[PDB]
């Protein structure tokens, strides 16, 4: 519409780490990282205040095994900020949610040393109201899961926020009366609390992590078949009565039960308790009772004696948190025959490194976001018209951690000068000799022309 600018209407702008807001309301996107946005509604801020929302790149929030941050820690201020109405903060993340297998949780620390879960109490009507008079549009939930954007709604501000990737958890309060707590991801997984198993009322939680035959079969083949991992979150707690767990059998004695009673950040240790605990098979599921809250797992391994080791071989891998990251390849030509090649795996890292631009390096390849697994190594090889120097010695590799730098220096020589210097670069989880298994990502390339200096 051709209407004079109100000068009393929300502010549309971008910020780097801090900005100015007044009860007028504003939408502040961030140039540094796409999808980072603050949406303060009109009339929901008492007075003009300087707001801050910087990624801290304080004390790390406690994280059990199988969990990792989805995004760098979010710092917002003023620390004690209070608003009449809820305000929206949107952060991009890199945790691979794997459909509904995994989920995100939000933590907040007022002082920076203690973290508590963040839950917001608001009305269903408020959600539509939250926009108020703003002309902004809110992405649908599916369109948010697709863009890997996490939306924190908050009616107050804390010193820090954290987005944490974890295995989906179903939680419901339970007290003396009794209770049932079933799984959404795996409906057959279930836990029953009898009358009088707890004294106080607690919010019990249940995780179920299902198995992917590609990884299990790859590490063990037909040696064993597992069921999902069922976890009762208030671990290391004796129950005054016995809980009744149900777990579907592993699709194929021959069936062992494994449990890990470790708590906190302690790495888990698996033991077999099949002899001690009775197992009941109904409707292709197993039901047992247990007085303790622990991890649980079923195995259909033929070699019962080694069953625990098999679990360790699988667990060690599948606990690794999955991150969706980008692969970027840079190169400079020493001469036509040879060249230097720097490779990176990045999450939140700089889109275009200054060093490469300064050294006259060129972006030659750049993969779409792909699942790489936290803390596991990466193997790199080139298979096309050029090859990378190697000998009867160890190869070169880099390890992926989230939000750290992940660099691999390389030297590559054109194999033959008959045709153009294009190539194929593959990043794998295991070295290539047998049948090659899916790599981590594939990038084709083309060496840039020689620069004379």
């Amino acid at each position: 519409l051709d209407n004079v600018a109100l000068s009393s209407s929300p502010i549309h702008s971008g910020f780097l780490v801090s900005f100015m807001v007044d009860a007028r309301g504003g939408a502040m996107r961030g140039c540094r990282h796409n999808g980072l946005r603050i949406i303060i509604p009109p009339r929901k801020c008492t007075a003009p205040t300087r707001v801050t929302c910087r990624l801290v790149k304080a004390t790390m929030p406690p994280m059990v095994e199988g969990e990792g941050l989805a995004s760098r820690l979010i710092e917002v201020g003023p620390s004690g900020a209070q608003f009449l109405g809820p305000v929206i903060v949107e952060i991009p993340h890199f945790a691979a949610l794997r459909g509904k297998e995994r989920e995100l949780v939000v933590l907040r620390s007022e002082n920076g040393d203690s973290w508590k879960e963040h839950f917001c109490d608001y009305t269903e009507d408020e959600l539509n109201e939250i926009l108020n008079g703003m002309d902004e549009v809110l992405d649908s939930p599916e369109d948010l899961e697709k863009k890997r954007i996490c939306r924190i709604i908050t009616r107050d501000f804390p010193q820090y926020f954290a987005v944490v990737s974890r295995i989906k958890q179903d939680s419901n309060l339970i007290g003396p009366e009794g209770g049932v707590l079933s799984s959404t991801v795996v409906p057959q997984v279930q836990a029953v609390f009898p009358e009088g198993a707890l004294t106080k009322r607690i919010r019990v939680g249940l995780q179920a992590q299902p198995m992917h035959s590609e990884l299990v079969k790859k590490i063990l083949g037909n040696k064993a078949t597992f069921s999902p991992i069922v976890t009762l979150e208030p671990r290391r707690r004796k129950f005054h009565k016995p809980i009744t767990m149900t777990i579907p059998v592993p699709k194929a004695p021959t069936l062992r039960l494994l449990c890990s009673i470790t708590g906190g950040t302690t790495p888990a240790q698996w033991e077999d308790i099949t002899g001690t605990t009775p197992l009941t098979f109904v409707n292709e599921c197993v039901s047992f009772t247990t007085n303790v809250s622990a991890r649980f797992w079923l195995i259909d391994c033929r070699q019962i004696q080694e069953s625990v080791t098999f679990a360790s071989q699988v667990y060690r891998e599948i606990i690794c948190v999955p991150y969706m990251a980008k692969f970027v390849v840079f190169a400079k030509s020493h001469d036509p025959i040879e060249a230097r090649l720097r490779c990176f795996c990045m999450t939140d890292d700089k889109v275009d490194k200054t060093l490469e631009q300064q050294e006259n390096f060129a972006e030659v390849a750049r993969s779409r976001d792909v699942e790489v697994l936290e803390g596991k190594p990466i193997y790199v090889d080139c298979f096309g018209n050029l090859v990378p120097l190697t000998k009867s010695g160890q190869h070169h590799i880099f390890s992926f951690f989230a939000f750290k730098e992940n660099r691999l220096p390389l030297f590559v020589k054109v194999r033959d000068t008959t045709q153009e210097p294009c190539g194929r670069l593959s990043f794998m989880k295991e070295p290539k000799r047998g049948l090659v298994h899916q790599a981590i990502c594939n990038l084709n390339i083309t060496l840039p022309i020689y620069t004379k200096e």
Partner: protein, 301 residues
């Protein structure tokens, strides 16, 4: 015989060459900046000495030329060995010169980066201050003085930033071993400076927003004060006629002031909510009440 004396001269020259090599291979690079400077001077003197020795090796060249023929198979190989060995020592001179320079530059560049980082920090603390003023006159002073700080720091910091960035751009162009670290160092400064430029913007915005609110809470106190002047009308003749005319002109003045104040007050409602809004329409209610009573009394006249 003659060959023996020539061997003696070659031995002395070879000894000198080794002595220089051994002194030039020393691994000590330095501690403070001056230590690496003094070592770069020292090694420059060694390099000049090596260049000066060219005449001394020339004497051997002449002696070998005038000796080369009793048994020159050994003589030619030995002298040629001195030729390539001396060339090698010269190249090693260029090497150690370069590494002492690059060590020195790492030392100074680190000093400047740390100093600039502490300098931005000092400015940042003064830019992210939360003081906004107790009275309108004082907030006005802070607004002007801070604006001066914004310009002075705004241009002052740019020269320092450009100096550090160019110093990095160059040391990367050279091929410094630590170039990778240096790159992040520059990225650290470039972002931090940018944030300060943004911070000082928000702070300046905050001061402006404060000034208008104080302006309202100036007139509310000041204009309400002129309300008491109206009481003079109740007790109060050519002289009286002149005073009355002046008084009516004063009322005409007043009308513009109250209209401008109310219009100014309107903006605060848009920019404030809750406790603050309520307190604004509050004082904007008190002054308007004075307007109503004063206008009623003037109407009675």
């Amino acid at each position: 015989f003659q060959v023996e004396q020539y061997y003696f001269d070659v031995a002395e020259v070879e000894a000198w060459l080794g002595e220089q090599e051994l002194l030039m291979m020393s691994e000590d690079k330095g501690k403070d900046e001056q230590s690496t400077l003094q070592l770069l001077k020292k090694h420059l003197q060694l390099e000049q000495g090596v260049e000066n020795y060219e005449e001394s090796i020339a004497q051997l060249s002449r002696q070998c030329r005038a000796l080369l023929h009793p048994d020159s198979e050994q003589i030619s190989r030995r002298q040629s060995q001195v030729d390539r060995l001396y060339v090698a020592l010269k190249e090693l001179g260029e090497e150690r010169r370069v590494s002492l320079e690059q060590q020195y530059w790492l030392y100074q560049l680190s000093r400047q980066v740390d100093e600039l980082e502490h300098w931005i920090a000092e400015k940042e603390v003064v830019a992210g201050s939360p003081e906004l003023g107790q009275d309108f006159e004082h907030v006005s002073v802070l607004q002007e003085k801070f604006s001066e700080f914004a310009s002075e720091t705004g241009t002052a910091g740019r020269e320092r930033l450009a100096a550090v960035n160019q110093m990095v751009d160059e040391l990367i162009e050279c091929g410094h071993t630590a170039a990778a670290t240096m790159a992040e160092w520059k990225d650290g400064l470039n972002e931090a400076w940018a944030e300060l430029l943004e911070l000082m913007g928000t702070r300046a915005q905050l001061l402006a927003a404060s000034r208008e609110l104080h302006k309202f809470f100036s007139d509310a106190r000041e204009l309400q004060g002129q309300i008491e002047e109206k009481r003079r009308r109740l007790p109060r003749a050519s002289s009286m006629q002149r005073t009355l005319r002046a008084f009516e002109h004063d009322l005409q003045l007043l009308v513009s002031q109250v209209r401008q104040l109310q219009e100014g007050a309107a903006q605060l409602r848009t920019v404030y909510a809750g406790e603050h809004a309520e307190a604004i329409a509050s004082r904007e209610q008190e002054v308007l009440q004075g307007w109503k009573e004063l206008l009623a009394a003037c109407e009675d006249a």
